[PDB]
Each structure stands twice: as structure tokens, then as C-alpha cells.
Amino acid sequence: NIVHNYSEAEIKVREATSNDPWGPSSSLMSEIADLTYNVVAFSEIMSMIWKRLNDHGKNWRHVYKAMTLMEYLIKTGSERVSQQCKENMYAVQTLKDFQYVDRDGKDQGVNVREKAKQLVALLRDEDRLREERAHALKTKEKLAQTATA
């Protein structure tokens, strides 16, 4: 990871992409999105996400949640997020053929492939990206003004 103690941003990314049977919460992803505007945190955040995406088989949740977070940051964080993804398109495209059938015969990998496929389509369509971002930013805005339960 090339860091001593993890920064708060790195801890948040790891938590959001933990190898656990649950997806990232919107509140946590929203915090990470704000952090993408911090010049130092941006680099730490992207580096950790690319690393969590670098995994296989039984660790598919790391990959799936990392893509979910990347998708969120592409649409809701600094524009530099989508810019770096476009520059490293190959690293997103490889996930389109990720495979994993668990020991019960359940294909978990197909969902990783589908998300990668749709994410790639989004990143290559500039007009869609602008629309998705406007809608995503409004959603984060609405989220911030909605009370708990």
C-alpha cells in the first residue's frame, strides 16, 4: 500500500470495500467522495481502490464492492476520478471477464462481469457521464438533507 499507518481516507476505502456479505453504505461513500477533492487523499483513495480491485475467486466481494465505490466516485466525486479511470481503461475492462463459481456451484463472478461491463460503457460515453453526474450529485445532496429513522 506504500503507507505506514493508514490515513483516515484509506481506512474508509478499505471499510467500504471489506470482504463482507454487505455493500458499501451511501453515507460512507459520500464521505469518500468529499475526500477525493483533497489532493493528498485523492491519490491514496485511488491507489487503494485499484488494489482492492486486484483480487480473485472467493475474494470477489472486495472486487465487487470496490467497483461499486469506483462507480459512485466516478459519478459523485472529483472529476479527476473519472479522468484517471479513462486513462487506465484497461484496468476496468479486464474485470469484464472476471470469473468465480463458488463451491456450491453459484456463479458470483457473473455479477462482477456485468457491473464492469456497464461501468465501462458509462466511462466511454461522455454525454451519459455528465447526465449521470448531475443526477448523482443531486442524490447525494438529497441524501445529506434526509433525516435518519
Side-chain angles (χ1 to χ4, degrees):
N1 307 308
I2 318 176
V3 190
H4 178 55
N5 280 174
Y6 287 131
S7 61
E8 279 303 305
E10 294 175 312
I11 288 174
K12 292 185 189 299
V13 171
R14 291 175 67 77
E15 172 178 353
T17 61
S18 65
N19 190 174
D20 294 297
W22 61 74
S25 80
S26 290
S27 62
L28 177 55
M29 292 196 282
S30 182
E31 304 185 319
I32 299 175
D34 287 327
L35 290 176
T36 61
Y37 289 96
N38 178 304
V39 69
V40 180
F42 175 79
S43 295
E44 307 177 330
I45 292 169
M46 297 301 293
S47 183
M48 189 61 65
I49 291 175
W50 290 122
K51 289 178 169 53
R52 270 293 159 85
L53 285 169
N54 182 12
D55 221 317
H56 308 88
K58 63 173 59 181
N59 295 331
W60 69 275
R61 288 177 189 286
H62 268 174
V63 183
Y64 190 75
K65 292 172 70 173
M67 273 197 297
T68 298
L69 172 62
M70 190 65 102
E71 178 177 60
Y72 185 92
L73 299 179
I74 281 167
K75 302 178 183 181
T76 331
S78 167
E79 293 186 304
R80 296 183 66 205
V81 176
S82 60
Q83 184 53 60
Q84 182 169 306
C85 287
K86 293 174 188 176
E87 305 182 313
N88 303 303
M89 199 68 92
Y90 181 74
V92 183
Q93 283 171 168
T94 61
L95 289 173
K96 295 175 67 175
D97 211 31
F98 173 95
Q99 277 188 20
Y100 186 58
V101 175
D102 63 39
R103 294 183 294 140
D104 293 311
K106 314 292 184 175
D107 190 331
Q108 305 308 327
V110 69
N111 286 304
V112 173
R113 299 199 287 287
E114 182 62 13
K115 180 168 286 295
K117 175 180 178 181
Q118 301 305 339
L119 184 57
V120 165
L122 172 64
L123 284 164
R124 308 190 71 180
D125 191 331
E126 278 299 69
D127 290 350
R128 273 189 64 188
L129 190 53
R130 297 180 182 181
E131 302 182 309
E132 295 278 345
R133 280 183 60 73
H135 289 271
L137 287 173
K138 292 174 68 66
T139 294
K140 175 182 175 176
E141 208 163 52
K142 181 178 183 177
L143 168 69
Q145 62 83 284
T146 53
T148 317

Short mmCIF file of all heavy atoms in Angstrom, two decimals, residues 41-105:
data_model
loop_
_atom_site.label_atom_id
_atom_site.label_comp_id
_atom_site.label_asym_id
_atom_site.label_seq_id
_atom_site.Cartn_x
_atom_site.Cartn_y
_atom_site.Cartn_z
N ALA A 41 -5.37 12.94 -0.23
CA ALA A 41 -6.30 11.82 -0.10
C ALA A 41 -6.70 11.20 -1.44
O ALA A 41 -6.89 9.99 -1.54
CB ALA A 41 -7.55 12.27 0.66
N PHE A 42 -6.82 12.03 -2.48
CA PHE A 42 -7.20 11.53 -3.79
C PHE A 42 -6.30 10.38 -4.23
O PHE A 42 -6.78 9.32 -4.61
CB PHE A 42 -7.12 12.64 -4.85
CG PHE A 42 -7.38 12.15 -6.24
CD1 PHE A 42 -8.69 11.93 -6.69
CD2 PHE A 42 -6.33 11.87 -7.10
CE1 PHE A 42 -8.94 11.43 -7.97
CE2 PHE A 42 -6.56 11.37 -8.38
CZ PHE A 42 -7.87 11.15 -8.82
N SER A 43 -4.99 10.59 -4.16
CA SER A 43 -4.02 9.57 -4.56
C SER A 43 -4.13 8.31 -3.72
O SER A 43 -4.08 7.20 -4.24
CB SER A 43 -2.60 10.13 -4.46
OG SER A 43 -2.42 11.18 -5.39
N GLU A 44 -4.29 8.49 -2.41
CA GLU A 44 -4.41 7.34 -1.51
C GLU A 44 -5.68 6.56 -1.81
O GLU A 44 -5.69 5.33 -1.82
CB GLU A 44 -4.44 7.82 -0.06
CG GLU A 44 -3.28 8.74 0.29
CD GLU A 44 -3.37 9.27 1.71
OE1 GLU A 44 -4.50 9.45 2.22
OE2 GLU A 44 -2.30 9.55 2.30
N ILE A 45 -6.77 7.29 -2.03
CA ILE A 45 -8.05 6.68 -2.33
C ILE A 45 -8.01 5.85 -3.61
O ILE A 45 -8.40 4.68 -3.61
CB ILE A 45 -9.16 7.75 -2.44
CG1 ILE A 45 -9.42 8.37 -1.06
CG2 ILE A 45 -10.44 7.12 -3.00
CD1 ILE A 45 -10.29 9.63 -1.09
N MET A 46 -7.53 6.45 -4.70
CA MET A 46 -7.48 5.74 -5.97
C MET A 46 -6.55 4.53 -5.90
O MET A 46 -6.88 3.46 -6.40
CB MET A 46 -7.03 6.67 -7.10
CG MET A 46 -7.99 7.82 -7.38
SD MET A 46 -9.77 7.23 -7.85
CE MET A 46 -9.37 6.41 -9.56
N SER A 47 -5.40 4.70 -5.26
CA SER A 47 -4.46 3.59 -5.15
C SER A 47 -5.08 2.39 -4.43
O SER A 47 -4.96 1.25 -4.89
CB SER A 47 -3.19 4.04 -4.41
OG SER A 47 -2.24 2.98 -4.36
N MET A 48 -5.75 2.65 -3.31
CA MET A 48 -6.37 1.57 -2.55
C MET A 48 -7.51 0.90 -3.32
O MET A 48 -7.70 -0.31 -3.21
CB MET A 48 -6.89 2.08 -1.20
CG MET A 48 -7.36 0.98 -0.25
SD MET A 48 -5.93 -0.26 0.22
CE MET A 48 -4.78 0.95 1.18
N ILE A 49 -8.26 1.68 -4.09
CA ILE A 49 -9.35 1.08 -4.86
C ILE A 49 -8.80 0.16 -5.95
O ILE A 49 -9.31 -0.94 -6.15
CB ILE A 49 -10.27 2.16 -5.50
CG1 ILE A 49 -11.04 2.89 -4.40
CG2 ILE A 49 -11.25 1.51 -6.48
CD1 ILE A 49 -11.88 4.06 -4.88
N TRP A 50 -7.77 0.60 -6.66
CA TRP A 50 -7.18 -0.23 -7.71
C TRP A 50 -6.65 -1.54 -7.09
O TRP A 50 -6.71 -2.60 -7.72
CB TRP A 50 -6.03 0.49 -8.42
CG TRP A 50 -6.46 1.64 -9.30
CD1 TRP A 50 -6.06 2.94 -9.20
CD2 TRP A 50 -7.34 1.59 -10.43
NE1 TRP A 50 -6.64 3.70 -10.18
CE2 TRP A 50 -7.43 2.90 -10.95
CE3 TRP A 50 -8.08 0.57 -11.05
CZ2 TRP A 50 -8.22 3.21 -12.06
CZ3 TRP A 50 -8.86 0.88 -12.16
CH2 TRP A 50 -8.93 2.20 -12.65
N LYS A 51 -6.13 -1.45 -5.87
CA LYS A 51 -5.60 -2.62 -5.18
C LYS A 51 -6.71 -3.58 -4.74
O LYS A 51 -6.57 -4.79 -4.84
CB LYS A 51 -4.76 -2.19 -3.97
CG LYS A 51 -3.44 -1.55 -4.36
CD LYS A 51 -2.66 -1.08 -3.14
CE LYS A 51 -1.24 -0.70 -3.53
NZ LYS A 51 -1.23 0.29 -4.65
N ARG A 52 -7.82 -3.03 -4.25
CA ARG A 52 -8.93 -3.87 -3.84
C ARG A 52 -9.56 -4.55 -5.07
O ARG A 52 -10.12 -5.64 -4.98
CB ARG A 52 -9.97 -3.05 -3.07
CG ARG A 52 -9.70 -3.02 -1.56
CD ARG A 52 -9.91 -4.41 -0.97
NE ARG A 52 -9.23 -4.63 0.31
CZ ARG A 52 -9.71 -4.31 1.50
NH1 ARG A 52 -10.90 -3.74 1.62
NH2 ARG A 52 -9.01 -4.58 2.59
N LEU A 53 -9.44 -3.90 -6.23
CA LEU A 53 -9.97 -4.45 -7.48
C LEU A 53 -9.07 -5.59 -7.96
O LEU A 53 -9.47 -6.41 -8.79
CB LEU A 53 -10.03 -3.38 -8.57
CG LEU A 53 -11.16 -2.35 -8.44
CD1 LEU A 53 -10.91 -1.20 -9.43
CD2 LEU A 53 -12.51 -3.02 -8.73
N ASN A 54 -7.84 -5.62 -7.45
CA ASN A 54 -6.85 -6.64 -7.82
C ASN A 54 -7.03 -7.83 -6.89
O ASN A 54 -6.32 -7.98 -5.89
CB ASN A 54 -5.44 -6.05 -7.71
CG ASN A 54 -4.34 -7.02 -8.12
OD1 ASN A 54 -4.60 -8.07 -8.71
ND2 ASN A 54 -3.10 -6.66 -7.83
N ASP A 55 -8.01 -8.67 -7.20
CA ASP A 55 -8.26 -9.84 -6.37
C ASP A 55 -8.96 -10.91 -7.19
O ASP A 55 -9.39 -10.66 -8.32
CB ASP A 55 -9.08 -9.46 -5.13
CG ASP A 55 -8.58 -10.17 -3.88
OD1 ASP A 55 -8.28 -11.37 -3.97
OD2 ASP A 55 -8.50 -9.52 -2.82
N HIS A 56 -9.09 -12.09 -6.60
CA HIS A 56 -9.66 -13.22 -7.31
C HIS A 56 -10.58 -14.14 -6.52
O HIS A 56 -10.66 -14.09 -5.29
CB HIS A 56 -8.52 -14.07 -7.88
CG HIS A 56 -7.54 -13.29 -8.68
ND1 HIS A 56 -6.44 -12.67 -8.12
CD2 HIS A 56 -7.50 -12.99 -10.00
CE1 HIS A 56 -5.78 -12.02 -9.06
NE2 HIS A 56 -6.40 -12.20 -10.21
N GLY A 57 -11.25 -15.01 -7.27
CA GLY A 57 -12.14 -16.01 -6.70
C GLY A 57 -12.97 -15.66 -5.49
O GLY A 57 -13.80 -14.75 -5.52
N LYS A 58 -12.76 -16.41 -4.41
CA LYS A 58 -13.50 -16.23 -3.17
C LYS A 58 -13.45 -14.81 -2.60
O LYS A 58 -14.24 -14.47 -1.72
CB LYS A 58 -13.01 -17.22 -2.10
CG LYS A 58 -11.55 -17.04 -1.68
CD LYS A 58 -11.20 -17.94 -0.50
CE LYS A 58 -11.41 -19.41 -0.82
NZ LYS A 58 -11.09 -20.29 0.35
N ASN A 59 -12.53 -13.99 -3.09
CA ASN A 59 -12.43 -12.61 -2.61
C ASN A 59 -13.18 -11.66 -3.55
O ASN A 59 -12.89 -10.46 -3.59
CB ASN A 59 -10.96 -12.16 -2.52
CG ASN A 59 -10.17 -12.94 -1.49
OD1 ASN A 59 -10.72 -13.42 -0.49
ND2 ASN A 59 -8.87 -13.06 -1.71
N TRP A 60 -14.14 -12.20 -4.29
CA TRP A 60 -14.90 -11.41 -5.25
C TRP A 60 -15.62 -10.20 -4.65
O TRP A 60 -15.86 -9.22 -5.34
CB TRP A 60 -15.92 -12.28 -5.99
CG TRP A 60 -17.03 -12.77 -5.11
CD1 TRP A 60 -17.03 -13.89 -4.31
CD2 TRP A 60 -18.31 -12.15 -4.93
NE1 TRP A 60 -18.23 -13.99 -3.65
CE2 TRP A 60 -19.03 -12.94 -4.01
CE3 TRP A 60 -18.92 -11.00 -5.46
CZ2 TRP A 60 -20.33 -12.62 -3.60
CZ3 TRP A 60 -20.21 -10.68 -5.05
CH2 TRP A 60 -20.90 -11.49 -4.13
N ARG A 61 -15.99 -10.27 -3.37
CA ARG A 61 -16.69 -9.13 -2.75
C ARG A 61 -15.80 -7.89 -2.71
O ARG A 61 -16.29 -6.77 -2.86
CB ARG A 61 -17.18 -9.50 -1.35
CG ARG A 61 -18.35 -10.47 -1.34
CD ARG A 61 -18.75 -10.86 0.08
NE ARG A 61 -19.73 -11.94 0.13
CZ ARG A 61 -21.02 -11.80 -0.16
NH1 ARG A 61 -21.51 -10.63 -0.53
NH2 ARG A 61 -21.83 -12.85 -0.07
N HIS A 62 -14.50 -8.09 -2.50
CA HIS A 62 -13.54 -6.98 -2.48
C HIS A 62 -13.66 -6.26 -3.82
O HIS A 62 -13.76 -5.03 -3.88
CB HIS A 62 -12.11 -7.51 -2.36
CG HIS A 62 -11.61 -7.62 -0.96
ND1 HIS A 62 -10.40 -8.19 -0.65
CD2 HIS A 62 -12.15 -7.21 0.22
CE1 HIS A 62 -10.21 -8.13 0.66
NE2 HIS A 62 -11.25 -7.54 1.21
N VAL A 63 -13.62 -7.05 -4.89
CA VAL A 63 -13.69 -6.55 -6.25
C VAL A 63 -15.04 -5.90 -6.56
O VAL A 63 -15.10 -4.80 -7.12
CB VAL A 63 -13.44 -7.69 -7.26
CG1 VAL A 63 -13.46 -7.14 -8.68
CG2 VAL A 63 -12.10 -8.37 -6.96
N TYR A 64 -16.12 -6.59 -6.21
CA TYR A 64 -17.46 -6.08 -6.48
C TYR A 64 -17.75 -4.77 -5.74
O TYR A 64 -18.29 -3.83 -6.31
CB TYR A 64 -18.53 -7.11 -6.08
CG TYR A 64 -19.91 -6.73 -6.56
CD1 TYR A 64 -20.26 -6.85 -7.90
CD2 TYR A 64 -20.86 -6.22 -5.67
CE1 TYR A 64 -21.52 -6.47 -8.35
CE2 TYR A 64 -22.13 -5.83 -6.12
CZ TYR A 64 -22.45 -5.96 -7.46
OH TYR A 64 -23.68 -5.57 -7.92
N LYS A 65 -17.38 -4.71 -4.46
CA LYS A 65 -17.61 -3.50 -3.67
C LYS A 65 -16.68 -2.38 -4.11
O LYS A 65 -17.06 -1.21 -4.10
CB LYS A 65 -17.46 -3.83 -2.18
CG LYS A 65 -18.58 -4.76 -1.70
CD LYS A 65 -18.38 -5.28 -0.28
CE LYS A 65 -18.56 -4.19 0.76
NZ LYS A 65 -18.52 -4.76 2.14
N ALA A 66 -15.46 -2.73 -4.51
CA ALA A 66 -14.52 -1.73 -4.99
C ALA A 66 -15.08 -1.10 -6.27
O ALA A 66 -14.96 0.11 -6.49
CB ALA A 66 -13.17 -2.36 -5.27
N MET A 67 -15.70 -1.91 -7.12
CA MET A 67 -16.28 -1.36 -8.35
C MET A 67 -17.49 -0.49 -8.02
O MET A 67 -17.72 0.54 -8.66
CB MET A 67 -16.70 -2.47 -9.32
CG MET A 67 -15.59 -2.93 -10.25
SD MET A 67 -16.34 -3.90 -11.74
CE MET A 67 -17.10 -5.37 -10.76
N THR A 68 -18.27 -0.90 -7.02
CA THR A 68 -19.44 -0.13 -6.61
C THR A 68 -18.98 1.24 -6.12
O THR A 68 -19.59 2.27 -6.43
CB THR A 68 -20.20 -0.84 -5.48
OG1 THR A 68 -20.68 -2.11 -5.95
CG2 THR A 68 -21.40 0.01 -5.02
N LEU A 69 -17.89 1.26 -5.35
CA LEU A 69 -17.36 2.52 -4.84
C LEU A 69 -16.78 3.36 -5.99
O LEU A 69 -16.98 4.58 -6.04
CB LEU A 69 -16.28 2.26 -3.79
CG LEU A 69 -15.49 3.49 -3.31
CD1 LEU A 69 -16.44 4.48 -2.64
CD2 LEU A 69 -14.40 3.06 -2.33
N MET A 70 -16.07 2.72 -6.91
CA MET A 70 -15.47 3.46 -8.03
C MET A 70 -16.58 4.11 -8.85
O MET A 70 -16.46 5.26 -9.26
CB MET A 70 -14.64 2.54 -8.93
CG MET A 70 -13.83 3.31 -9.96
SD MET A 70 -12.46 4.42 -9.15
CE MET A 70 -10.92 3.29 -9.50
N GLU A 71 -17.64 3.35 -9.08
CA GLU A 71 -18.80 3.82 -9.83
C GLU A 71 -19.37 5.06 -9.13
O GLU A 71 -19.64 6.09 -9.77
CB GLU A 71 -19.83 2.69 -9.85
CG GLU A 71 -21.14 2.97 -10.53
CD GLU A 71 -22.02 1.73 -10.53
OE1 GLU A 71 -22.35 1.24 -9.44
OE2 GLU A 71 -22.38 1.25 -11.63
N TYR A 72 -19.55 4.96 -7.82
CA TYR A 72 -20.07 6.08 -7.04
C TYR A 72 -19.15 7.30 -7.14
O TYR A 72 -19.62 8.42 -7.35
CB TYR A 72 -20.21 5.66 -5.57
CG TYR A 72 -20.85 6.71 -4.69
CD1 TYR A 72 -22.23 6.72 -4.47
CD2 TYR A 72 -20.08 7.69 -4.08
CE1 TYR A 72 -22.82 7.69 -3.67
CE2 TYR A 72 -20.66 8.67 -3.28
CZ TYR A 72 -22.02 8.66 -3.07
OH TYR A 72 -22.58 9.63 -2.27
N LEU A 73 -17.84 7.10 -6.98
CA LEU A 73 -16.88 8.20 -7.05
C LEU A 73 -16.80 8.81 -8.45
O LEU A 73 -16.57 10.02 -8.60
CB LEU A 73 -15.49 7.73 -6.60
CG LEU A 73 -15.44 7.22 -5.15
CD1 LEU A 73 -14.03 6.76 -4.81
CD2 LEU A 73 -15.87 8.34 -4.21
N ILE A 74 -16.98 7.99 -9.47
CA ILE A 74 -16.95 8.47 -10.85
C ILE A 74 -18.11 9.46 -11.02
O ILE A 74 -17.95 10.53 -11.62
CB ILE A 74 -17.13 7.31 -11.86
CG1 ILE A 74 -15.81 6.55 -12.02
CG2 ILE A 74 -17.63 7.84 -13.21
CD1 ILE A 74 -15.96 5.23 -12.75
N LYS A 75 -19.26 9.10 -10.48
CA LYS A 75 -20.47 9.92 -10.60
C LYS A 75 -20.63 11.03 -9.57
O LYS A 75 -21.29 12.03 -9.85
CB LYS A 75 -21.71 9.03 -10.51
CG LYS A 75 -21.81 7.93 -11.56
CD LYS A 75 -23.07 7.09 -11.34
CE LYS A 75 -23.14 5.93 -12.33
NZ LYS A 75 -24.38 5.12 -12.13
N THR A 76 -20.03 10.87 -8.39
CA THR A 76 -20.21 11.83 -7.30
C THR A 76 -18.97 12.52 -6.73
O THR A 76 -19.10 13.49 -5.98
CB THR A 76 -20.93 11.13 -6.12
OG1 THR A 76 -21.77 10.09 -6.63
CG2 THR A 76 -21.78 12.13 -5.36
N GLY A 77 -17.79 12.03 -7.07
CA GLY A 77 -16.59 12.66 -6.55
C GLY A 77 -15.97 13.63 -7.53
O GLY A 77 -16.61 14.06 -8.49
N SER A 78 -14.71 13.99 -7.28
CA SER A 78 -13.98 14.89 -8.16
C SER A 78 -13.96 14.33 -9.58
O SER A 78 -13.91 13.11 -9.78
CB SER A 78 -12.54 15.04 -7.66
OG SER A 78 -11.73 15.66 -8.65
N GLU A 79 -13.98 15.22 -10.57
CA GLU A 79 -13.93 14.78 -11.96
C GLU A 79 -12.63 14.03 -12.24
O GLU A 79 -12.56 13.24 -13.19
CB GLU A 79 -14.07 15.97 -12.91
CG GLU A 79 -15.44 16.63 -12.85
CD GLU A 79 -15.62 17.72 -13.88
OE1 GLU A 79 -14.80 18.66 -13.90
OE2 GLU A 79 -16.57 17.64 -14.67
N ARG A 80 -11.62 14.26 -11.41
CA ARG A 80 -10.34 13.58 -11.58
C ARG A 80 -10.49 12.07 -11.45
O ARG A 80 -9.66 11.31 -11.96
CB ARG A 80 -9.32 14.07 -10.54
CG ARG A 80 -8.94 15.53 -10.65
CD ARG A 80 -7.87 15.86 -9.62
NE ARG A 80 -6.62 15.16 -9.90
CZ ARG A 80 -5.70 14.86 -8.98
NH1 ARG A 80 -5.90 15.20 -7.72
NH2 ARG A 80 -4.58 14.24 -9.33
N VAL A 81 -11.54 11.63 -10.75
CA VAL A 81 -11.76 10.20 -10.59
C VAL A 81 -12.06 9.57 -11.95
O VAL A 81 -11.39 8.62 -12.37
CB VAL A 81 -12.95 9.89 -9.63
CG1 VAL A 81 -13.19 8.39 -9.58
CG2 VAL A 81 -12.64 10.41 -8.21
N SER A 82 -13.05 10.11 -12.65
CA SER A 82 -13.40 9.57 -13.96
C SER A 82 -12.24 9.77 -14.93
O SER A 82 -12.00 8.94 -15.81
CB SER A 82 -14.67 10.24 -14.50
OG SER A 82 -14.52 11.64 -14.63
N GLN A 83 -11.50 10.87 -14.77
CA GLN A 83 -10.38 11.12 -15.66
C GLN A 83 -9.32 10.03 -15.51
O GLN A 83 -8.82 9.51 -16.51
CB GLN A 83 -9.74 12.48 -15.38
CG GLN A 83 -8.61 12.82 -16.35
CD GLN A 83 -9.03 12.69 -17.81
OE1 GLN A 83 -9.96 13.37 -18.26
NE2 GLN A 83 -8.35 11.82 -18.55
N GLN A 84 -8.98 9.67 -14.28
CA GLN A 84 -7.98 8.64 -14.07
C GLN A 84 -8.49 7.27 -14.56
O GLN A 84 -7.71 6.47 -15.07
CB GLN A 84 -7.57 8.55 -12.61
CG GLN A 84 -6.49 7.50 -12.37
CD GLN A 84 -5.89 7.58 -10.98
OE1 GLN A 84 -5.41 8.64 -10.55
NE2 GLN A 84 -5.89 6.46 -10.28
N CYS A 85 -9.79 7.01 -14.40
CA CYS A 85 -10.35 5.74 -14.86
C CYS A 85 -10.27 5.64 -16.38
O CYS A 85 -9.95 4.59 -16.92
CB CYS A 85 -11.81 5.60 -14.41
SG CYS A 85 -12.00 5.25 -12.64
N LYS A 86 -10.56 6.74 -17.07
CA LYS A 86 -10.49 6.74 -18.53
C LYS A 86 -9.04 6.50 -18.98
O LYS A 86 -8.80 5.79 -19.95
CB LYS A 86 -10.97 8.07 -19.10
CG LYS A 86 -12.44 8.37 -18.89
CD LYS A 86 -12.75 9.77 -19.38
CE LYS A 86 -14.15 10.21 -19.03
NZ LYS A 86 -14.38 11.62 -19.45
N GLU A 87 -8.09 7.09 -18.27
CA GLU A 87 -6.68 6.93 -18.61
C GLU A 87 -6.22 5.50 -18.36
O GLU A 87 -5.30 5.01 -19.02
CB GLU A 87 -5.82 7.89 -17.78
CG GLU A 87 -6.23 9.35 -17.90
CD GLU A 87 -5.33 10.29 -17.11
OE1 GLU A 87 -5.04 9.99 -15.93
OE2 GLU A 87 -4.91 11.32 -17.67
N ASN A 88 -6.85 4.82 -17.41
CA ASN A 88 -6.49 3.45 -17.09
C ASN A 88 -7.65 2.51 -17.42
O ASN A 88 -7.94 1.57 -16.67
CB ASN A 88 -6.13 3.35 -15.61
CG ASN A 88 -4.99 4.28 -15.23
OD1 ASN A 88 -3.91 4.23 -15.81
ND2 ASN A 88 -5.25 5.15 -14.26
N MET A 89 -8.29 2.77 -18.55
CA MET A 89 -9.43 1.98 -19.00
C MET A 89 -9.16 0.48 -19.02
O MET A 89 -10.04 -0.31 -18.70
CB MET A 89 -9.86 2.44 -20.40
CG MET A 89 -11.27 2.02 -20.77
SD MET A 89 -12.57 2.95 -19.67
CE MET A 89 -12.90 4.46 -20.83
N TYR A 90 -7.95 0.08 -19.41
CA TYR A 90 -7.62 -1.34 -19.46
C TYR A 90 -7.88 -2.03 -18.12
O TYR A 90 -8.39 -3.16 -18.08
CB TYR A 90 -6.16 -1.56 -19.84
CG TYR A 90 -5.79 -3.03 -19.93
CD1 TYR A 90 -6.21 -3.80 -21.01
CD2 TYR A 90 -5.05 -3.64 -18.92
CE1 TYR A 90 -5.90 -5.16 -21.08
CE2 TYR A 90 -4.74 -5.00 -18.98
CZ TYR A 90 -5.17 -5.75 -20.06
OH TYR A 90 -4.86 -7.10 -20.13
N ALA A 91 -7.53 -1.35 -17.04
CA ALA A 91 -7.71 -1.90 -15.70
C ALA A 91 -9.17 -2.10 -15.31
O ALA A 91 -9.47 -2.87 -14.39
CB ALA A 91 -7.02 -1.00 -14.67
N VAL A 92 -10.09 -1.42 -15.99
CA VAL A 92 -11.51 -1.59 -15.69
C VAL A 92 -12.05 -2.68 -16.60
O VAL A 92 -12.81 -3.55 -16.17
CB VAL A 92 -12.30 -0.28 -15.94
CG1 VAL A 92 -13.76 -0.47 -15.54
CG2 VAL A 92 -11.68 0.86 -15.15
N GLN A 93 -11.63 -2.64 -17.86
CA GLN A 93 -12.06 -3.61 -18.86
C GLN A 93 -11.71 -5.07 -18.55
O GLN A 93 -12.47 -5.97 -18.92
CB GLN A 93 -11.51 -3.21 -20.23
CG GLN A 93 -12.28 -2.06 -20.87
CD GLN A 93 -11.63 -1.50 -22.12
OE1 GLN A 93 -12.25 -0.72 -22.85
NE2 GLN A 93 -10.39 -1.88 -22.36
N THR A 94 -10.58 -5.31 -17.89
CA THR A 94 -10.20 -6.68 -17.57
C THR A 94 -11.23 -7.36 -16.67
O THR A 94 -11.43 -8.57 -16.75
CB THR A 94 -8.83 -6.76 -16.85
OG1 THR A 94 -8.89 -6.04 -15.61
CG2 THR A 94 -7.73 -6.17 -17.73
N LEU A 95 -11.89 -6.57 -15.82
CA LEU A 95 -12.89 -7.10 -14.91
C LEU A 95 -14.12 -7.65 -15.63
O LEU A 95 -14.91 -8.39 -15.04
CB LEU A 95 -13.30 -6.03 -13.90
CG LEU A 95 -12.19 -5.75 -12.88
CD1 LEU A 95 -12.54 -4.56 -12.00
CD2 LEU A 95 -11.97 -7.00 -12.03
N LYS A 96 -14.28 -7.31 -16.91
CA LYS A 96 -15.41 -7.80 -17.68
C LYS A 96 -15.36 -9.32 -17.87
O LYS A 96 -16.36 -9.93 -18.24
CB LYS A 96 -15.46 -7.10 -19.05
CG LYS A 96 -15.75 -5.61 -18.94
CD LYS A 96 -15.68 -4.90 -20.29
CE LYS A 96 -16.79 -5.35 -21.22
NZ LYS A 96 -16.75 -4.55 -22.49
N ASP A 97 -14.21 -9.94 -17.62
CA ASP A 97 -14.13 -11.39 -17.76
C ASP A 97 -13.71 -12.07 -16.45
O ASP A 97 -13.18 -13.18 -16.45
CB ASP A 97 -13.19 -11.79 -18.91
CG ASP A 97 -13.61 -13.11 -19.57
OD1 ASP A 97 -14.83 -13.39 -19.60
OD2 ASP A 97 -12.74 -13.85 -20.06
N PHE A 98 -13.95 -11.38 -15.34
CA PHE A 98 -13.66 -11.92 -14.01
C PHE A 98 -14.54 -13.16 -13.82
O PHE A 98 -15.73 -13.12 -14.15
CB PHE A 98 -14.00 -10.89 -12.93
CG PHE A 98 -13.88 -11.41 -11.52
CD1 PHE A 98 -12.71 -11.22 -10.79
CD2 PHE A 98 -14.94 -12.09 -10.92
CE1 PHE A 98 -12.60 -11.70 -9.49
CE2 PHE A 98 -14.84 -12.59 -9.62
CZ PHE A 98 -13.66 -12.39 -8.90
N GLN A 99 -13.98 -14.24 -13.29
CA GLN A 99 -14.78 -15.44 -13.06
C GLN A 99 -14.69 -15.97 -11.64
O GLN A 99 -13.64 -15.92 -11.00
CB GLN A 99 -14.36 -16.57 -14.02
CG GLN A 99 -14.99 -16.51 -15.41
CD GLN A 99 -14.71 -17.76 -16.24
OE1 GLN A 99 -14.37 -18.81 -15.70
NE2 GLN A 99 -14.86 -17.64 -17.55
N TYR A 100 -15.83 -16.46 -11.15
CA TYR A 100 -15.91 -17.10 -9.85
C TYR A 100 -17.22 -17.84 -9.62
O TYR A 100 -18.29 -17.23 -9.54
CB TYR A 100 -15.71 -16.15 -8.67
CG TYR A 100 -15.67 -16.92 -7.35
CD1 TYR A 100 -14.73 -17.94 -7.15
CD2 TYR A 100 -16.60 -16.69 -6.34
CE1 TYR A 100 -14.72 -18.70 -5.99
CE2 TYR A 100 -16.60 -17.45 -5.17
CZ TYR A 100 -15.66 -18.45 -5.00
OH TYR A 100 -15.65 -19.20 -3.85
N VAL A 101 -17.11 -19.15 -9.55
CA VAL A 101 -18.25 -20.02 -9.27
C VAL A 101 -17.83 -20.59 -7.91
O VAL A 101 -16.76 -21.19 -7.81
CB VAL A 101 -18.37 -21.16 -10.30
CG1 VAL A 101 -19.49 -22.11 -9.90
CG2 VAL A 101 -18.63 -20.58 -11.68
N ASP A 102 -18.64 -20.38 -6.88
CA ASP A 102 -18.28 -20.87 -5.56
C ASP A 102 -18.42 -22.39 -5.45
O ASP A 102 -18.83 -23.05 -6.40
CB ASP A 102 -19.10 -20.18 -4.45
CG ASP A 102 -20.59 -20.45 -4.56
OD1 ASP A 102 -20.99 -21.58 -4.90
OD2 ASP A 102 -21.38 -19.51 -4.29
N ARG A 103 -18.07 -22.93 -4.30
CA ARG A 103 -18.13 -24.37 -4.11
C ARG A 103 -19.53 -24.95 -4.07
O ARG A 103 -19.70 -26.17 -4.04
CB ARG A 103 -17.33 -24.74 -2.86
CG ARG A 103 -15.84 -24.46 -3.03
CD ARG A 103 -15.04 -24.90 -1.83
NE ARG A 103 -15.35 -24.10 -0.66
CZ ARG A 103 -15.46 -24.60 0.57
NH1 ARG A 103 -15.28 -25.90 0.77
NH2 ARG A 103 -15.75 -23.80 1.59
N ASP A 104 -20.55 -24.09 -4.10
CA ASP A 104 -21.93 -24.55 -4.12
C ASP A 104 -22.44 -24.48 -5.55
O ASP A 104 -23.61 -24.78 -5.82
CB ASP A 104 -22.81 -23.68 -3.21
CG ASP A 104 -22.47 -23.84 -1.75
OD1 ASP A 104 -22.36 -25.00 -1.30
OD2 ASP A 104 -22.30 -22.82 -1.05
N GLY A 105 -21.56 -24.09 -6.47
CA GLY A 105 -21.93 -24.00 -7.87
C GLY A 105 -22.60 -22.69 -8.25
O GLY A 105 -23.07 -22.54 -9.38
#
